[PDB]
Structures are given as C-alpha cells and as structure tokens.
A paper describes a structure:
The E. coli 50S large ribosomal subunit is composed of 33 proteins (L-proteins), one 23S and one 5S rRNA. The 23S rRNA consists of six architectural domains that, stabilized by the L-proteins, define the shape of the 50S subunit with its three protuberances. Here, we present a biochemical and cryo-EM based analysis of the earliest period of 50S assembly, utilizing an in vitro reconstitution system with purified rRNA and L-protein components.
The early states were designated according to the 23S rRNA domains whose cryo-EM densities they exhibit (e.g., d1, d12, d126, etc.). The precursors d12 and d136 exhibit intrinsic flexibility along certain hinge regions located in domain interfaces (red dotted lines), while the individual rRNA domains remain relatively rigid. Nevertheless, the relative domain movements from the most open to the close conformation allow for the formation of inter-domain contacts between H11/ H37 and H21/ H51 and H11/ H37. The presence of domain II apparently facilitates docking of the CP-forming 5S RNP and as a consequence, route 1-2-6 involves the possibility of CP formation either on d12, or d126 resulting in d12-CP, or d126-CP, respectively. As our system enriches certain states (such as d12, d12_L23, and d136), we have been able to refine highly resolved maps of these interesting early pre-50S intermediates.
Numbering used by the authors:
A (entry chain Y): 1 to 63
B (entry chain E): 1 to 58, 71 to 201
C (entry chain U): 1 to 102
D (entry chain S): 1 to 82, 98 to 110
E (entry chain J): 1 to 75, 86 to 142
F (entry chain R): 1 to 103
G (entry chain Q): 1 to 117
H (entry chain L): 2 to 27, 70 to 137
The structure:
RNA sequence: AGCGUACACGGUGGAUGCCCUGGCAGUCAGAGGCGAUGAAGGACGUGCUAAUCUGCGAUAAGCGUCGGUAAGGUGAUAUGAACCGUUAUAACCGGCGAUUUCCGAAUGGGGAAACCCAGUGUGUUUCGACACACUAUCAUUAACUGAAUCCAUAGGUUAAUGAGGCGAACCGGGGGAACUGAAACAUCUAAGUACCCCGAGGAAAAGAAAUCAACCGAGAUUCCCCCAGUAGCGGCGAGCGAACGGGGAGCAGCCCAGAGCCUGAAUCAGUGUGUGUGUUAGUGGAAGCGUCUGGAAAGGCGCGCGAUACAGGGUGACAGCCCCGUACACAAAAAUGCACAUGCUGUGAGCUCGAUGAGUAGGGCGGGACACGUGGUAUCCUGUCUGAAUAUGGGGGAUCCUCCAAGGCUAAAUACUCCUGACUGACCGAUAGUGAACCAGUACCGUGAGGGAAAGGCGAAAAGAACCCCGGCGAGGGGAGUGAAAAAGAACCUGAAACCGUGUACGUACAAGCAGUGGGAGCACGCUUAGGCGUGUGACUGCGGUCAGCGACUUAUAUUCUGUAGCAAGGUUAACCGAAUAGGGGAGCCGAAGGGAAACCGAGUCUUAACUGGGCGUUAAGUUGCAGGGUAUAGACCCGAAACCCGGUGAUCACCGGGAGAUAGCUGGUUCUCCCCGAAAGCUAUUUAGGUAGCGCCUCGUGAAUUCAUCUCCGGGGAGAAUGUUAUCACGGGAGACACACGGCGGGUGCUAACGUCCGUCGUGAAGAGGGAAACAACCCAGACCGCCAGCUAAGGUCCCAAAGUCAUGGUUAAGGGGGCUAAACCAUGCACCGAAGCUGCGGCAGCGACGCUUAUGCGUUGUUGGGUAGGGGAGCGUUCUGUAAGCCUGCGAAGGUGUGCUGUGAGGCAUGCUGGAGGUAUCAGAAGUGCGAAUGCUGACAU
C-alpha cells in the first residue's frame, strides 16, 4: 500500500485522494458522532492514508 | 643496610639514612594529612543575604534570621592545598620506608612479572607468596602486570616514581623490585 | 535483544516460587513478565453488571521481574543463562553449559 | 467482648458533642437511645447515629443479647481544622 | 535508722483537771499551752497533736496582780465586765495567745475545756487530777 | 538488748541481729571486725557507762558489702545569675550485720 | 557540614523535664519555667540538706527535755550531770531511748544527778 | 596504619569558640659585605674585582666589596689588591 | 627555750590589712588553730599588736 | 477598553521602554506577558 | 460539681530518623548565535477522550525514502475500548526530506495578540465560491520611464542583495550619578562605579618603534610570577600606585609604495575525486550451586568459577558469577568536521633598480573641550595661508646614542558561558538546596512596573478491601479478604512537644502567694513472709502566651606572638613545564654586622678638634609549613533609620527595581561541661570633649637577687628570730575597669549637719552565702570543696508562740513582734544550756609546694588551699562529614520515638522492654552551615 501506489500517475492519485477524503472522512465523522462506528480503527486508518496520499501528489508532479 | 632478596639470598646495599632513619611520627602525620587535604575539591557555595532572590526593605526578608533568608557566613569555593617542603616530603618517605623495613612489611624480589595479562596468573603468584593486599612497586611498568592487577581490589601496582606517603601506609605489605628499590634510593638521595 | 520471549519455559529463581516452572504469557514493557501459575493474586474486582464481570474474587496472575526468571532447558533439568550467537544470516539464542542452541 | 464504632471528621464542635456524650456515659443502651431521642441538641443526632451503628455492629458481629449492652467508653476528640471537626467514638460491650 | 515520729492514728492522750483558783493568769495559761501542745510528753512531734485534753475549773477565780484589772483590754470593753459575764473567755484568749497559728494550732486549742463551775459533763471520761 | 556504739563520728543504737549502716571502713568483705567501743548494754537492768569507752563491752559484726548511696544532685551555685551547676554526689557506705553482744 | 540540632536539643529538653514531674501544670510542662523551677528546687534542697541537722537537733533537744522534766530535772542540769559523769551518749540516742524505754532514761537521769553535785 | 598516626603534643590546638554556653569560659648602591663563609670555597675564589658575581655570593651588579669578618673563619684566604679593614689582618692571617 | 602556745580566738574578716598580715606572720591561718612560738620580743610585739582576737597559754 | 488602550500588548510594544518591559517579562517567564 | 499530680489508652500536630527522578559549586571537550525561505515567545487546535504534560500542525502523539533493531506494539498520568505485528513494510532509534493554522520585527489596510476587512496575478469551478503567490520602510546594483533643465538628473517602476527583531557573559565606543570617608570647607576617594545606547566578533582590542636607557645595552602585541604594595603621589592623611630589569606560555613578520629579467614558478582561498579518522542509530560481551534464618536472600554457613570486566544501576534485605551493564573486540545506506595526492579558477618562486609614504611635519594666528580656569599646565581639531631633502636628510634624548612616520595587514598564548556530552564533591537533603524536587515564576496581591508563596514518601507487587451490616441509594465506620505488616487504607514510612480527651490512684471548694523544699502520716498497687521497702498522691508542719525548626566571632589579604616539624649559616620556592600531590624551575624573599645624622669605619663602631662619655654588636639561628592568640583593611559576631541618585510604571487618588549587606549614632541578642587564679569604676598630660598617650589593678610563661610583709632594737635608712606555697621586681602575650553606692575615722566647704565635693584609713555590696536585731544591701558575729537523723562554740538568747534557767547570790522598779509577766522588767556576779554553712569527728573529690618508692601515672605522707561578677589560664563532652572502611554491628532487627537500670563532679556514655522496619559505625587523625532561654527575631502548629 505504501509503495505499490507510487507508480500511479498524478491524475489518478488526485481522483483517489478526492474520493477517499470526501467520502471516508465525512462518513466516519458523521457515524462517529451518531453513536455508530463502535470501532475507532477506521478513524485513524483513513486519516493516515489521507496523509500518505498528501505526501505524494506534490513531488510526483512537482507540486 | 642489607635486605634479603627472598629468592637468591643476596643482600642489597641501601643507605642507612634512607631505609634506617628513626621513625619521625609528627613529620609523617603532617605529610599524610597534607596529602589528604590536597585531594579536597572545595566546590561549594551558599547564597548570602544579598544573593537570595527578592527585593524590598519593608527590616528585610533576606536577613539570616528570617526563613528562606541568606546564610550568615555563606561559604565560597576555596582551595585547601597545603605547601609541603621538598625536604619534609623526602624525610617522611624515608621514615615510612625505614618503619616498613623494621616491621617486616616490606619484601624485595628479583623480578615480578607475569607471562600474559591474565588476572588468574597474578592471583596464583600472590597466593604462592601468601600475599593478599600488597603494593607492587616496579621500575619499567609491565603491561601484563598492570592489566592483571587492575581488577584485584586488594592488590595495587605502580612504578617507583609514583609512590605516595599514603599508599605505602594504607597497604599491608609493599613489594619493591630490586630495580624499584634502586630507583627509590636515587629519588630520595 | 530480549532473552525472555513468548512461550518460553522458565523457572522462577526467587520470590516465593523457588523451583516452580512455568510458561511465559507476555512480557511487559516495564521489565516485568507474566508466567502461568507462579504468582497468584486474589484481586477483589469491583462489580460491573456490564462488560462481562468475572464475579467475586478473581484469582489471576501477577507480574514479576524478568531478572527472577531463568530459561529452563530439558537437556539438564536446571535453569541456565542464555546468550546470543550469530548464525549464517540470523541471530539465535543458546544456553550456556555446552552452548546448546535453542 | 467489645464493639467499637466511630464517626470521623464530624462537622460539629468537640465541646458540643461532649455535652451530649456526658449525658449517657456509663448508661445502658436501652435507655441511652430513648434519652437521645428527645434531646434537642444538634449533636444528639450524631451521637444517636453512632450509637445505633455500634449496636448494629455488635449485633451482626456477635451472637445475641443486645439488651445488656452498656455504654462503657464514649469520647469525642478534636479533629482537623478548616470550625474544628470532631471524632466521635462509642464502645458498647455486654460486660 | 530514722527518728521516731508520732502517728496521729495511735496517739495516747489522757484527760487532766486543773483548778485556776489563786493562780496567775499568765503562768497558768503558759502551763496550759505547754500541756496542750504535748511538749511535756516525750512523744512530742511538732506536726502531730500529741497533747492531752485538759479541763479548767473556776475560771472566775483568775487572779492578776498590779493594775492590770484596768489596763487589760480585749476586743472596746474592760476586763471587769468580761470576767463578770464570761470568765471562760479570758482563759480561752490567753491560751490562744500561746499556740501556733494554723489548722493544727486550732485543733490543739479545741482540746482545752474551760468552765466556771466545778461540775462538768465530762466526768464520765474519768479525768485525772493535775496540780499547779 | 541494744548497744550504742560510735564508728564514723555519729553514734548508732543497734539491736541484736538487725544490720546497720556505717561510713566506709577499709576492711575486707569477708573479714569480721570487732567494735571495741561500746557505750551501753540493755538488759533487765541495763549497765551504764561507769567510765567512758566501756572496755568490758565489745560488739562483733561482719561486713557484707560496700557500695554507694543514692545519687544526690547538689547545686552549689546560688544568687540567681542565670547559671547552671548541678554536681553529683554519692557517699560511700557499708552495711554491717552484728552478731553477739557482750555485757 | 550542615548539622541539624533537633536530636540533641530534644534530648536535653527531655532530660531537664524528666526531673520536673509534678510541678502544678506549667512548671511541669513549659520548659522556660520548668528550668527555673528545677533550679529553685535544687537550691532549696541544698539549703534543706543543712537545715535538716538543725531541725533534728531541735527535735531531739525538745524530746530529751520533755523526758527529763518527767524525772524532775531540767535539760541544762541533765546535760551538766551527763558531762560531769563522763557520758558520751549523743542527743540522738538520748531521744531514742527516751521515746522507746523509760527505764534506761531513768537510769541516765539518776546517774546525771549523782554526779551533778 | 593510618589509625596509629597522630601529631606531636601541642601541635594542633582546638581554638576557642566564644559565645557557646556559660561554663566554657567565654656609593651605597654599590656597597656590599663579604663574610668568611662566602667565597670560602668556590673553586677559584681568588680575591679580585671579578669572579665574584659568577659565584652568586652577593648581589648581581655589585662592584665594590670589603673583607668584613663575622666569625666562622676556617679558610686561610689571602686578600691583596682589595680594601682590607684594620681588624681583618688578625683573623685572616690566623 | 620555753615554748608558748598561741590560739586564734576571733575572726579576721572585718580587720585591717595590717592585722591580717600580723595573723599570717603568727601562723594563725584559721580560727581556733593552736600553734607554738618561741620567746622573743618580736613575738611579744606581734601578740600585743593583735590581742583582742588571740589567746596565749 | 481603558485598560487595553494603555497596558495592552500593542501599546506596550509601541514604545522602547515597553519593549524592554516585555523582554524582562519573557526572561522571567511569566504565563501572561501583558494581561 | 470542677481543678492538680503520676500511669495507661486515643485525636490535631508533622519535629526527628532513612531515601532521591531536585538544586549548588567546578573540571575536561564542542559551540558561541537564531530569523522575511518568517526568529525568541505565545494563542488555538490535534487521540476512540471528561482533564493535564509531551509530541505534532487542517498531511496536526503524525507522512515518504534509506539504515540498525525487532516480538511486541498504538507516549504518560491510569486504566479501558478498538486495532496492527510475530522473520522482515508492527512498533522503536538515527540520516535525508514533505507538510508546518494564527499573533508576534509582522511586513496588504485596520486593530484591543492570537481578530476584522481588501486589491492584483494564476489554477480550478457546482461559472456562486474556493486554492497558491505578491501588495510596509530604508540602503545598494542593472534597466525603463522621468520635472526644476534640451540632453541629463531628483523621483516612480521592473529584476537582484543587506537591515529592521530576539539573546547570558566577554570586547570596543559614546553617555553617565548619588550616599559615604579622610581632624574640618575645597579637593580626592566614592567612580569612570551604579545605570543608559550603537557595533562585529568567537574571542575582541593591540601588534613591529621616528620606544627606552645611558656611552654597557633590551628589542612586535597580549597574559602569568617577582621587582613592589617598592620608588612615587596624596590637608605625606584616608587612600592611589610605577617603571627599568629578571623568570615563564606563544614567538611570525609581512604586503604595496612602480619598473626591469626567466615566467603564470612554491604557498594561499575556492572548486571535485579516493582512503583513513571521528559525530548522528548500533552488535557480541566471562563465570553459582546446597543449606539456616527469614514475607522475600543479594545476608551467615561450605565448596566452586570469571576477571584487559570487583566503574555503576535494578531486582521481595547488602549480588563479580539474576538482568542491564563495564573492560575489550566490531559496526554506517545517508548527512557531516578533519588529514592528505589529484583536474580547474584567481593573488604568483627568485634577483636588480626605485621608494622609504608631501600640499605632509614645521611656522603660526583664535577659540573652545579634555577635572586641569595661565594656575606647576600638558593635550585633540581647525575658520585660515605658507610649506622643506630624500640615509649625503629628518625625529627624540655641541658630542654621543636609537628609528625611518605622515600606506595597510597580522593566528599563537588572553576574558566569559545562553547551550550540548561526560565526570567529579570531607556541597544541601523538603523551615536546607533555586523563589520552584509536586501542574512554580503557578496560586495569589496590585489597574502598573512589580511582588510572590505553602505543597515529597502506602506497598516488593494495587494484590487499592469481593462479600455482609449500620447509616440518608451519603460522609463515616464494624466484620470478611489481600498483604510479612491495615500499630501500611489512598489525609496512607517513621509520628516527639505544645494542645485537646477517657479510665485508674491520691489530694483539694472565703481574699493570702506559693503551690517548691526537709520531716511526714494517710490512702492504692507490688515487695518483704513482719524491720516502717519502691512507685502514685501529699492532710500536718520549719524555711521560702506555649511547643518544634531556623539564628549569630566565619572567609580573604598584610603584620606581631606562642606551640609544633624539616633543614641549619643556610632556609626557600612563585609563574610555568611536568611521566601532573613526584621531579625540574634559585627569577625572587629573609638572615648571617653593626655602629654611625649622612659620610665614614667595621668585630669592632660615634659625637667634640680627640674625650676623664657611654657605645652597638658576636658569644642568643635564621628560614620554610602546620595550628592557634591579637591588630588593620574588606559586609567583618548578628538584627535594627530617616535621607540622596539612576532606570522605569502610574497622574483612574505617587509606586517598583538598582547604587545598597549604604551611611551615622544608640539599644537588643550571642547557644555545651568542669578546674585554678581573680579585677576595677582610681592617678599623670593632652583635651578638635571624640577621646587620646601613659600610669594603676588582674591573669598566663620566663628570668631575677632568697625579694617582699608582719614584730623588736638602733638612727631620723641599718641590724635581729620565726611565719607567709615569692605574697617582691623586670620582661613578653592577653585582659577587664576607666559614671561605683552606702557608712565608722582625720577633713576643707558647711546649719563647725549631709547619702553636694575629692582626699588617706578603710568595712560592706558590686563580685559573699549563713546566724542574730520581727523582715530589711548600710548594725554585730561570720567567708559556703561535697555528704553525714554527730559534737563544741562566736554575735544573740533560755515563760509560750520558738531550742535552751519560771537557775542562784544582792539591790532598783507599779512604764506597761502578740498572750503576759510586779519580774516573764533594770543594775552586777557565778554555774550552766541553746545558738551558723565558724571549729572539731568520719567518709569523699580536686589544685599547689617538700621529703622517700615510681620519674607519665599510681603511693607513705607532708602540709596547705578550694565564695565569686568582668577577665586570664588549663582540661574535657556532644553532632555532620572525610581516611582508617569492600573492616565491624545489623531483618535473630539499624537510624529515630518512648520508659527503666547502671555509670561519670558534668557536658555525656552503655544495656534493655515496646514502637520502628534498614541502615549505623569502633580506635586514631582531619574540616566545621557545631551545642539556644528571650534579640517588640522568622516559619508552622497550638492556645486566648
């Protein structure tokens, strides 16, 4: 996961980052506050994955 | 006088004034006290009434009588070294050597060395001579002997030029090699 | 490295259990370890209807210093100290007393 | 046999509680209870509660015969300040 | 050892009778005080009432020489009226004058019993006769 | 039967048997000393001192042990000058048991 | 070389107070007055170690005089008779025999009278 | 034997600490002098205006010296060419 | 020769220093002390100087 | 607003003496530099 | 009914004992800056979060790559839920990076700090918004525009660079006080100190003679030790303070001045390569078992083993062999400092001639300011003109001596620590050390600068009390259980005193003035088998604001003396080097020769022309360390003012920090024991009334004639007996007193009174206790070494109070502290007795002299002495720490708390019961933050 997606092009990195953020962040935050989502593993996992994608997408395309 | 070598039954000629002078108790005590005082590291200090953090004169809070105030006679780092005349030092060493000779606490050997730097060999050698807490004084320091004797707490090793009044007293017996004996004789004149 | 690992048969050298063998469950990060049936405590747990209250007095296992447990080898039946040795590519533990690799 | 019961850090003055305690020292519990019942002093409630606790402890921790219990050692000690709190102590024993 | 000390529990005292007829007030009172204090007995102890009870009869027969009949004053009457009304008071005050000041002194003084008439209710105690 | 004798400058009247307290006398514990001085012998008709230092009366006594008396704290200082001086004193003594009295 | 003075000070105060027991409250508990009370008690003891001889001498003289008066002689005349009779009996023993057995004192007084003239 | 070692009697005094308790009590510049001990034996101490500074007996820059005598005469040193005191002819020649 | 006996009778606290020196010369260092002396005019003068506090026998 | 207009952080920082006061406060390490 | 006493059992209290994740003081190395590419310091967020610390910044206890390591891990409080990983993509550590909200120089504008409001350019677009960059000033460079003024310039614009601010000391420069002291203004010191401002630095500054000196000579700057606290300056007073020269660490002198000859020649700084050596993670790393106590062994007992590792730490009590470690041997993908040979850009090896610094010095002319006013007056500059030759000449001190300025640079030794790593300590251990060991510059106080605390400990492991009961579904407690211990329960190690309580035994209720002491019954408990014995109380009787802690003569430099040790006419090193307490270093200082105004002489020496003058020395040994007693200077044994100045904060009606531990004067306090001796409040001159310089009394050590005192005689000092521990004199150290009171005697003055005056005799007290006159410092007797339930006495007394004569021999007397006495008063005598801490009797201790055992003690003795304020001398106890000491005691019980017994003249010491539950320390030496009963002392608690 960490390096397998390194070879991905900038456009698909952009689209997957947008999808991941706009879907997972909102869904987890809403369910995390509505009493659902008894497990907190996903909350940290999605944030860490978003950070990892953010570290890419700038040096890959030169920012 | 004559010192038995304990291995060849050969006497060593040594000046009477060096290994036979009368034991001057006062001089030896003064020299050892001076040596002990020289090792002091007088690193300390207390805050006087003018150094304790604070201000105002509403008497004053920083007075010694007041709590958390300064010390009346706060000490400062000082040097406790005491001068000792060369002649006094040499006389003290000569008196100590003479007393050790008289009390049979001093023994002389042909050569003291071990084959390899192994503490076991040195321990066995000292056991053969019924020696447990001794100061071995030699000439050209041997790496093997120095390494072997480093671990043994009771046993110490040094060269003839590094003897001190306290070392010759604190250790039960002294083993000066013939070369070390000659070197000490020359050093003490 | 760590001389005591999971699922290692050990003997408690000292501390009320001289000679009682056991198997290590887990090793704490503070230097203590937990072994099967060497230190039994009678904890008086506070009741809680939820969270699966064990009920009554819980007879559980306490932690002991790692220095009080020694690796046990069936070769000689007596606990002996363990050192580390380099294999062709990896590092492995081995007892003393003829250096029998674990 | 001897049963103890004390109340620590009571919110009352030591002298006030002593004034009530002196009214039952050496008396029988059967009469101590109903003497404290009608006492209008504030410390009377505290002393009565402590005595009832002592009687209950004697009951549960001993066999029977609550009637013969006597107030042998009742005393109030000064407690920590902030209005000095008081430590009340009552000892009930058949003999 | 230790010098003997009289025990007040086991003090032995004997009653005595003294007649004041034809005797000087001062000397008779001095003898009375000495007898009350117990000094005459060998068992005398300063802190113990080791004396003996004494009964004085015929107090009105007190005789004093000189012009003391007018000079003497007790508390502001005169000696004559006092001897006429209460002869016992003169003897009582005199004896009080020769005793220590304190509870023990009062206790010793209480032993003395002075009356003007010879008859006395204490005859049942077999009081011995003493001469002065 | 009580005898009056002087040993250390103060007279003692001692009855037969009972031990008595005296000053320190340089005599061994085992030795039995004779008190050649007697001032009175008591009987049905006691014999008085016809001449001082009655020669016909001798008291036989044995010393049991020496010792020191009870500790006494003496303050020789006075005048209330805010000074403290509490010296200690323990007078030597000897207890002697008397056996046999000669008239 | 800092030294804390607590131990020695407490030991000294305890030693001083141990000999001040029973002094009516403050003088037995407050050190500042307990020390003065102890000093005053010591001084009074020093004075009384001497006054005891005087008091006992007076008591013995009184007892001897009282015993002699029973035999018809005064204390001064009795002492004169004893001295002229070459009698070394001490006043303590005289008082003791006077208070214990009267026969001995009768013999003493008779002998004193015999040598008085 | 560090225990046995002790100073001589009267060597070290405690030192009184007052205030504790009540019972505890409380041409000229170039002029010098030559002695008989001086230049007694300096391996060539012949009297002269020179060969005196080298021996290091009196000063460094001293140029004029006398033969003043202060006891301790044990060398038959002969003086010539330098000032001789009138009393110097009795002990030097003796 | 004949030897005389001199004994101090009275104290010397309230006396002049000359009297104290005379007593010291006479050897009477304590009241009641009895000492021997020879027969010389010097002794006679010493006794005469202080006689209200000494006795001669 | 009177307190802030005079002792406020901006007013104090405006003048050199106020800057020295703030420097002393920082050196001492007080939790609040101005208010 | 209460109160007091002793014991037992409890509570508040948190002293004491043990401990350290905290400080203090230093050594050795690194480093000496950070920031518009956005600093120091903050606000707000961020985890599954109710809160704090730490990390981090919308990529928010983390993200990417590369290495080490890895079977555990997701930071902690303080756990839980939910999850990842286990043999190489869990987590952890390090190198290299990405992200890095807002305030803050803050810089797009505004503003009340963390807030509000805009323009331009670009990307995106749900064609609404969103996303990134720029938008303050000055200075410099290139270019375009560009008025006065045609060109050109000032200015504007574009592109580029530097500063803006923060930070402890050190360096340079510019400003810059006051209090106070010198006999007193001035003057000096205070002090270029306190404090303010600008600058680069890792060090800075300075650095190579136009210097000194004297006819011999040193040769850059800076620093250390001597010279020397000397010469000198100074109302010659406080105080200030040299140079030459000598010994040391470093030692480096160069470039241009303008040309020539072969060239770019060595070296230098930059720019790359390869190796080694480190820094930033790390790997390996020796060798114990049985037994006895014990909760547990690392402790005792026995036998083994390692040691180039017995430095250290943890582990159920003290571990070389249990663990981490140490010695030693190894380790780097990446970044980085140093040492080399290497391609390359620039100053370019070496010789010759010039040059030797020119509108410059000098000449001046007038000012100002350097404290320096023409005063003893030196110094910088010009508003201003002139202006000399280049070694043959010029400058400084006629000869002589030294240099070549008016051009420039120069590491080394040298000062400090904001910070980083290691180590050390006769440094502290919670009232100490920092103000802060703990959520401290916090709580809190003031609008403000600023001021500014209290607060540590359960247990080995929370095993942190399931369960039952009283209570209000509380607080609190009693059982059960865990635990060695709950006499460890979260208010948690030890747990004293004041203070407040329960029980037992005893005593006691009108105002005394002490509730103590000697005697001492009685009452309760144990003895004893009775003897009147111990403990608890004390009828009767003689005499008569509190607790615990903290807190005070120390340290440095000079000088004098004493004791002690080495050497000895020699002694002795400083800086520095150093195998670093050794050894080297003799540069330096003291003495050995003094006399003499100097000169001069010399074991001899001078004055006067020389002395009938007396010399002054040698014959006595000085020097260097150690400890101590004094003196002076620094704050100077400790605490205690008003005032003046400087830098700031408030004028809502002066306050904060510093000079400053200011300076006076005058009170207050000054902590353990014992022994011996033992004062004074008096005199001379000065007297700037501050006192001063002496005399006088005291003590200690030495020397001295046997000195002095008393009594006798002689003469107006001499002689003679004995006694007095030399009580006599001199020298040297150290003192205290230097305002004395009362009274008899001889006074002057005078009430011919004096406690008004100062004298000689003095006695009492100060500094002397006791007896008597009722008490009473001034009246009499009398000088307390300690004990005795012994005796004899002095003053005074013998009727009772109150121990002793109602004694005797003769008279007088009716006057009447208490009763009273006709003698129980006054005048005489005699025998007696009482009468003190006086004397004697017994016992015991200590000081000082002589004779005989021992020659330090210990004895026959001999005797004598032993009140004591200030003061002097001597001998001791106690506590912390260091060596002895890896030895000894100690879990069979340490330190501490609390009782008892024994012991010492006492400071104190030993043993032991209970508590305590792990340290303590012998003997001999060494260093003190060393001994508390008060200073309107401080802190906490307890009272009122």
């Amino acid at each position: 996961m960490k390096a397998k997606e390194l070879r991905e092009k900038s456009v698909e990195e952009l689209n997957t980052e947008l999808l991941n953020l706009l879907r997972e962040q909102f869904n987890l935050r809403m369910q995390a506050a509505s009493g659902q989502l008894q497990q907190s593993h996903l909350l940290k996992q999605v944030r860490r994955d978003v950070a990892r994608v953010k570290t890419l997408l700038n040096e890959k395309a030169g920012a | 006088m004559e010192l038995v070598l304990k291995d060849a039954q050969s006497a060593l000629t040594v000046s009477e004034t060096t290994f036979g002078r009368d034991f001057n108790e006062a001089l030896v005590h003064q020299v050892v006290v001076a040596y002990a005082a020289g090792a002091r590291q007088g690193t300390r200090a207390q805050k006087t009434r003018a150094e304790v953090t604070g201000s105002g004169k509403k008497g004053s809070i920083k007075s010694p009588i007041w709590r958390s105030g300064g010390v009346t006679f706060a000490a400062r780092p000082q040097d406790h070294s005491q001068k000792v005349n060369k002649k006094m030092y040499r006389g003290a060493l000569k008196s100590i050597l003479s007393e050790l000779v008289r009390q049979d606490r001093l023994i002389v050997v042909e050569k003291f060395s071990v084959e390899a730097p192994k503490t076991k060999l040195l321990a066995q050698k000292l056991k053969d001579m019924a020696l447990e807490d001794v100061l071995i004084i030699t000439g050209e320091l041997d790496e093997n002997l120095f390494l072997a004797a480093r671990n043994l707490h009771k046993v110490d090793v040094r060269d003839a030029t590094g003897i001190d009044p306290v070392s010759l007293i604190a250790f039960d017996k002294v083993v000066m090699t013939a070369d070390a004996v000659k070197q000490v004789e020359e050093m003490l004149a | 490295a760590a001389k005591i690992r999971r699922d290692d048969e050990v003997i408690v050298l000292t501390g009320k259990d001289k000679g009682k063998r056991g198997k290590v469950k887990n090793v704490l990060s503070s230097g203590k370890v937990i072994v099967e049936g060497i230190n039994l405590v009678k904890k008086h747990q506070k009741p809680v209807p939820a969270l699966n209250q064990p009920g009554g007095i819980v007879e559980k296992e306490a932690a002991i210093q790692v220095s009080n447990v020694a690796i046990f080898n069936a070769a000689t039946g007596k606990a002996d100290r363990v050192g580390f040795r380099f294999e062709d590519g990896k590092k492995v533990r081995f007892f003393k007393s003829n250096s029998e690799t674990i | 046999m001897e049963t103890i019961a004390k109340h620590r850090h009571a919110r009352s003055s030591a002298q006030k509680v002593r004034l009530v305690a002196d009214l039952i020292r050496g008396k029988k519990v059967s009469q101590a209870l109903d003497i404290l019942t009608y006492t209008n002093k504030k410390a009377a409630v505290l002393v009565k509660k402590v005595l009832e606790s002592a009687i209950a402890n004697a009951e549960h921790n001993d066999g029977a015969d609550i009637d013969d219990l006597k107030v042998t050692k009742i005393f109030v000690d000064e407690g920590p300040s902030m209005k000095r709190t008081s430590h009340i102590t009552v000892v009930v024993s058949d003999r | 050892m230790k010098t003997f000390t009289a025990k007040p529990e086991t003090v032995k005292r004997d009653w005595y009778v003294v007649d004041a007829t034809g005797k000087t007030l001062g000397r008779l009172a001095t003898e009375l005080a000495r007898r009350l204090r117990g000094k005459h007995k060998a068992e005398y102890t300063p802190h113990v009432d080791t004396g003996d009870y004494i009964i004085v009869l015929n107090a009105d027969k007190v005789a004093v020489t000189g012009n003391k009949r007018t000079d003497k004053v007790y508390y502001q009457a005169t000696f004559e009226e006092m001897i006429a009304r209460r002869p016992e008071r003169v003897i009582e005050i005199a004896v009080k004058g020769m005793l220590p000041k304190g509870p023990l002194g009062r206790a010793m003084f209480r032993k003395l019993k002075v009356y003007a008439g010879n008859e006395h209710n204490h005859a049942a105690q077999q009081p011995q006769v003493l001469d002065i | 039967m009580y005898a009056v004798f002087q040993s250390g400058g103060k007279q003692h009247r001692v009855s037969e048997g009972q031990t008595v307290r005296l000053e320190k006398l340089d005599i061994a514990t085992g030795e039995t000393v004779e008190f050649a001085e007697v001032l009175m012998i008591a009987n049905g008709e006691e014999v008085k001192i016809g001449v001082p230092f009655v020669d016909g009366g001798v008291i036989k006594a044995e010393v049991v042990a020496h010792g020191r008396g009870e500790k006494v704290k003496i303050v020789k200082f006075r005048r209330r000058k805010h000074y403290r001086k509490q010296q200690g004193h323990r007078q030597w003594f000897t207890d002697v048991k008397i056996t046999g009295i000669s008239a | 070389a800092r030294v804390k003075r607590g131990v020695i000070a407490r030991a000294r105060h305890k030693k001083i107070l141990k000999q001040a027991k029973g002094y009516y409250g403050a003088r037995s508990r407050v050190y500042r007055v307990a020390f003065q009370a102890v000093i005053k008690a010591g001084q009074y003891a020093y004075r009384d170690r001497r006054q005891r001889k005087r008091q006992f001498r007076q008591l013995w003289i009184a007892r001897i005089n009282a015993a002699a008066r029973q035999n018809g002689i005064s204390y001064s005349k009795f002492i004169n008779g004893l001295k002229k009779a070459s009698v070394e009996i001490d006043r303590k023993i005289l008082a003791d025999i006077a208070v214990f057995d009267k026969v001995a004192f009768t013999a003493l007084v008779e002998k004193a009278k015999a040598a008085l003239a | 034997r560090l225990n046995t070692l002790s100073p001589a009697e009267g060597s070290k005094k405690a030192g009184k600490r007052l205030g504790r308790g009540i019972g505890s009590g409380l041409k000229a510049a170039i002029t010098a002098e030559i002695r008989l001990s001086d230049l007694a034996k300096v391996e060539g101490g012949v009297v002269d205006l020179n060969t005196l500074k080298a021996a290091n007996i009196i000063g460094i820059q001293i140029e004029f010296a006398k033969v003043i005598l202060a006891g301790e005469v044990t060398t038959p040193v002969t003086v010539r060419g330098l000032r001789v005191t009138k009393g110097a002819r009795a002990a030097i020649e003796a | 020769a004949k030897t005389i006996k001199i004994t101090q009778t009275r104290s010397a606290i309230g006396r002049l220093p000359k009297h104290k020196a005379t007593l010291l010369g006479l050897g009477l260092r304590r009241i009641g002390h009895t000492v021997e002396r020879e027969d010389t005019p010097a002794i006679r003068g010493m006794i005469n100087a202080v006689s209200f506090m000494v006795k001669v026998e | 607003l009177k307190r802030n207009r005079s002792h406020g952080f901006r007013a104090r920082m405006a003048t050199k003496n106020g800057r020295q006061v703030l420097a002393r406060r920082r050196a001492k390490g007080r939790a609040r530099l101005t208010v």
